[PDB]
């Protein structure tokens, strides 16, 4: 199911954009993969994404309401775990996209 090729640079785990080995992250729904460096993930994000069932940007469903929803423009991605949320499904709901870093309700401490 996982495609052993990065969707952005077409390299395997043996050859990222700098021709160095780097493991692939793979979408659990469509199988598409990418190097974290090609996905522009930091190591923190990469390790946490390697704590869950990950979806690529095209398969991503809202973690609260469990659907992709109608508009692509109103989903934001957590800077800690890459989960997607509708603005309306945040806590509290967001009237406006924040600037800079944003962390989702799942990552925030109890």
């Amino acid at each position: 199911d996982p495609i052993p090729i990065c969707s952005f640079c077409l390299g395997t785990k043996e050859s990222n954009r700098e021709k160095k080995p780097e493991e692939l992250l793979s979408c659990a729904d469509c199988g598409s993969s990418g190097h974290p460096s090609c996905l522009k993930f930091c190591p923190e994000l990469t390790t946490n994404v390697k704590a869950l069932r990950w979806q690529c940007i095209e398969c991503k469903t809202c973690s609260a309401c469990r659907v992709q929803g109608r508009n692509a423009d109103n989903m934001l991605f957590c800077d800690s775990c890459d989960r997607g949320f509708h603005m309306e499904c945040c806590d509290p709901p967001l009237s406006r996209m924040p600037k800079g870093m944003w962390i989702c309700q799942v990552c925030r401490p109890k």
Partner: peptide
Amino acid sequence: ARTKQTARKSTGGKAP
């Protein structure tokens, strides 16, 4: 915040 628009600009297009 990171959105589909910002993410696609940061990664660039998928390789055809």
